[PDB]
Amino acid sequence: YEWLNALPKAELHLHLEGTLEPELLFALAERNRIALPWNDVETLRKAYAFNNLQEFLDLYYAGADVLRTEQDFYDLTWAYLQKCKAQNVVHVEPFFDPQTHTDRGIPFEVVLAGIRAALRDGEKLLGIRHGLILSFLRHLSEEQAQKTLDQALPFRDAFIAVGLDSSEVGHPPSKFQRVFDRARSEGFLTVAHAGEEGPPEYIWEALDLLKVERIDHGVRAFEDERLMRRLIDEQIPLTVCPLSNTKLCVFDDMSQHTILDMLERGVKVTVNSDDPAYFGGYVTENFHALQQSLGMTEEQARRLAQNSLDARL
Ligand SMILES: Clc1ncnc2[nH]cnc12
Numbered sequence: 001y002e003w004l005n006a007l008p009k010a011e012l013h014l015h016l017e018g019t020l021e022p023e024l025l026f027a028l029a030e031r032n033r034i035a036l037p038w039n040d041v042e043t044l045r046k047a048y049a050f051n052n053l054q055e056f057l058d059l060y061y062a063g064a065d066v067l068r069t070e071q072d073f074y075d076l077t078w079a080y081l082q083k084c085k086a087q088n089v090v091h092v093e094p095f096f097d098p099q100t101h102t103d104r105g106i107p108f109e110v111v112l113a114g115i116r117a118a119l120r121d122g123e124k125l126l127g128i129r130h131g132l133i134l135s136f137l138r139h140l141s142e143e144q145a146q147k148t149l150d151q152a153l154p155f156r157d158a159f160i161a162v163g164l165d166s167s168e169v170g171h172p173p174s175k176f177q178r179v180f181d182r183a184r185s186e187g188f189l190t191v192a193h194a195g196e197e198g199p200p201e202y203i204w205e206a207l208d209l210l211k212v213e214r215i216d217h218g219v220r221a222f223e224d225e226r227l228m229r230r231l232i233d234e235q236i237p238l239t240v241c242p243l244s245n246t247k248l249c250v251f252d253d254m255s256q257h258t259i260l261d262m263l264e265r266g267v268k269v270t271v272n273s274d275d276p277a278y279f280g281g282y283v284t285e286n287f288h289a290l291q292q293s294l295g296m297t298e299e300q301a302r303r304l305a306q307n308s309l310d311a312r313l
């Protein structure tokens with residue numbers, strides 16, 4: 001572990017809202033004077049049992065209530081930048097979900113201020129380079145996304161890419177092709193969750209329609225050889241999330257996980273923690289689960305760590 005923790009890494013698939021620890025959640029609630037459904041930290045922590053993506057999501061959004069002030073968004077981001085320091089993540093390209101917050105009345109500018117501040121502290125004090133990614137909520141309309149992109153236009157230099165998360169199945173990338181088109185046009189790079197719960201088809205759609213620069217998750221590509229051959233050939237990065245997939249039941253066990261398999265095949269896979277407060281591990285704890293349940297070698301360790309550097313935007 002300490003050896004794994006010492007490796008230099010990049011984290012390219014990480015949702016800031018999913019770094020919200022039960023302890024922080026209770027504290028922000030107290031500061032904001034909010035009566036929580038949950039009786040204590042322990043009761044909330046026990047609630048992190050999932051049978052799929054949605055059950056997690058419903059919870060994950062409920063937690064966003066305590067996020068209300070610039071200082072809230074600072075605290076959340078800075079706490080994660082500190083974990084990055086502990087685990088020697090020297091670089092971050094994190095997600096946030098503007099709509100989760102703006103739809104609750106919080107001004108877009110407040111959300112951004114607190115995160116940006118934290119990120120500045122991250123680089124000047126911690127030596128952590130960052131590339132903020134703005135994610136669209138895919139269960140919601142393209143209209144709503146467009147409205148969000150309009151909010152982001154004045155801020156466009158704060159974001160290296162637009163992303164796409166939330167309930168994957170039944171909301172294909174094609175749903176958002178116009179806004180993504182428009183985003184690239186306004187000079188955004190792009191990325192997307194594809195093939196977490198949804199079919200490989202969604203991953204071709206991400207590559208070709210949404211013109212992503214990397215596939216987030218992407219594990220279900222394993223069912224599609226033609227796709228595999230493309231991944232391997234184009235060296236398109238995949239931001240894979242071990243704990244997330246186990247917690248969400250994408251795999252029934254860590255021993256069933258295919259990330260090493262892909263790696264030995266030449267796929268440019270990376271190790272990321274995704275929603276660390278909900279999956280019980282930051283990036284180092286992900287590498288470690290690989291070692292424990294799949295006898296990952298120090299060899300493959302260094303290799304996955306290096307891909308995360310290579311795949312930076
Ligand atoms: Cl991994 C993932 N998939 C869909 N929605 C999400 N929100 C935070 N992480 C997410």
Ligand SMILES: [Zn+2]
Nearest residue numbers: 013015165274
């Ligand atoms: Zn994710």
